Amino acid sequence: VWKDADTTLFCASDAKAHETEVHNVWATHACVPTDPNPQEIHLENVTENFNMWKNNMVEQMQEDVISLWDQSLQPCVKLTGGSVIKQACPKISFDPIPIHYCTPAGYVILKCNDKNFNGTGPCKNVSSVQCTHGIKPVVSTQLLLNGSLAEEEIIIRSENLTNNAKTIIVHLNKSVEINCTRPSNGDIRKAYCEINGTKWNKVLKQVTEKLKEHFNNKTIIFQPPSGGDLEITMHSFNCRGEFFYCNTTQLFNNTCINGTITLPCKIKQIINMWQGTGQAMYAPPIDGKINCVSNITGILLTRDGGANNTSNETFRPGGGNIKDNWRSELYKYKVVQIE
């Protein structure tokens, strides 16, 4: 017998104590080794309600990632609340590793195994586990990278679809590779991302058909972000310690919905910190080829308001709230206390 509850989680990883890579260094001091023989108990005739949008596991992961970035990625100049911090900004080894979240004694994690589970409401196939699967703390906007895929159909997630102010998470069931490169040797901040247009347009077409099921067969239209900070209007992510900002206008092409799509990107030193600590200037890029190949496994969308009297619904790539990134992986878990 159990009940919904929050508690202090701990983390587990397969980090190497000899690695200089910052995620390894953090997890070495902050996490324990993973369980080689994880146990999972499938419950019968159990109905449990879940709510990915109000899940304390998300806040805790956010706190971990903030801590990790604080100890690892130091900008040359910090501009937080009037005060200005000048400090050293060495180039680091950066590559996210899977982090597992685990409950202490007296608590268990319930896992929803329904194939079409949207993140909220009752779940019929529930199991109890001691730790979540390995989740890479990938910080990005617009596109969710290196995540897990939906096992069956594409899933649409939202706290309230009728509320256009609520972010929509699209969970893909098939990944699409995005290949980003800052050439070696010139504009040292110029870069680009390559995507297979055939693969992407097919997936995007399926996303539209899925959105139709949720919006009463209205016509689905994609548009580039209306405005805001560069972190929102562009697909921003971190590759090898360098902050990439990529223009995704070509990705959401309504006409296409087959060749290589090349997105124009820039490496930026001056960034609005996702932690919410204001603005910061990081160090200039390293020399040589800077390359990251990632799997697109999710999309963050914001729906246009004021379209009730039309047959169209307009969706733009957006987001910015990094907690949503963790929600896209933590949606199927919740903590309960055992009695």
Ligand X SMILES: *[C@@H]1O[C@H](CO)[C@@H](O)[C@H](O)[C@H]1NC(C)=O
Binding site for ligand 0LM (CB under 6 A): 139-141, 229, 231, 236-238, 243, 271-272, 274, 276, 320-322
Name the residue with tokens 């680009």: 192
Q: Please work out the total of residues on this chain that contact ligand X, with binding judged by CB under 6 A.
A: 51
Decide: 237 and 179 in contact? Cβ < 8 Å: no
Of 51, 71, 160, 223, the one binding ligand X (CB under 6 A) is 160
Q: Among residues 131 and 135, whose Cβ is nearest to ligand 0LM?
A: 135
Note whether 217 binds ligand X by CB under 6 A: yes
Q: What distance in Å separates the CA atoms of residue 13 and residue 27, rounded to the nearest whole number?
A: 7
Decide: 275 and 81 in contact? Cβ < 8 Å: no
Note whether 256 binds ligand X by CB under 6 A: yes
Q: Among residues 100 and 157, whose Cβ is nearest to ligand X?
A: 157
- Collapsed DSSP state (helix, strand, coil) of residue 324: helix
Note whether 247 binds ligand X by CB under 6 A: yes
Note whether 72 binds ligand X by CB under 6 A: no
Q: What distance in Å separates the CA atoms of residue 167 and residue 181, rounded to the nearest whole number?
A: 29
Q: Among residues 14 and 114, whose Cβ is nearest to ligand X?
A: 114
Name the residue with tokens 């995007």: 204
Of 28, 56, 72, 250, the one binding ligand X (CB under 6 A) is 250
CB of 241 to ligand 0LM, least distance (A): 11
CB of 236 to ligand 0LM, least distance (A): 4
Sort 118 into a burial class: Cβ within 10 Å, 0-12 / 13-18 / 19+.
Answer: middle
Q: What distance in Å separates the CA atoms of residue 270 and residue 289, rounded to the nearest whole number?
A: 21
φ, ψ for residue 287, nearest 5 deg: -80, 170
| Residue of closest CB approach to ligand 0LM | 274
Cα 51 to the chain's mean position, in Å? 18
Residues 96-115 binding ligand X (CB under 6 A) are 96, 113-115
Q: Which two tokens stand for residue 138?
A: 């990938």
Instruction: Give the one entry of ligand X, ligand 0LM, none that residue 139 binds, where binding means its C-beta sits below a cut-off of 5 to 8 angstroms depending on kind.
Output: ligand 0LM
Taking alpha carbons only, the member of 24, 157, 9, 48 closest to residue 98 is 24
Looking at residue 99, the DSSP 8-state letter turns out to be B
Note whether 293 binds ligand X by CB under 6 A: yes
Taking alpha carbons only, the member of 181, 172, 130 closest to residue 154 is 172
Q: What distance in Å separates the CA atoms of residue 302 and residue 304, rounded to the nearest whole number?
A: 7
Instruction: Give the one entry of ligand X, ligand 0LM, none that residue 33 binds, where binding means its C-beta sits below a cut-off of 5 to 8 angstroms depending on kind.
Output: none
Strand partners, 219: 312
CB of 246 to ligand 0LM, least distance (A): 11
Note whether 162 binds ligand X by CB under 6 A: yes
- Collapsed DSSP state (helix, strand, coil) of residue 232: helix
Q: Among residues 146 and 302, whose Cβ is nearest to ligand X?
A: 146
Instruction: Give the one entry of ligand 0LM, ligand X, none that residue 179 binds, where binding means its C-beta sits below a cut-off of 5 to 8 angstroms depending on kind.
Output: ligand X
Note whether 311 binds ligand X by CB under 6 A: no
Instruction: Please measure the distance between the N-terminal and C-terminal CA atoms of the chain and give it in whole angstroms.
Output: 5
Footprint of ligand X (CB under 6 A): 42, 96, 113-115, 118, 120-121, 124-125, 138, 145-146, 153-154, 156-158, 160-163, 173-175, 179, 181, 194, 196, 198-199, 206, 210, 213-214, 216-217, 233-234, 237, 239, 247, 249-250, 253, 255-256, 292-295
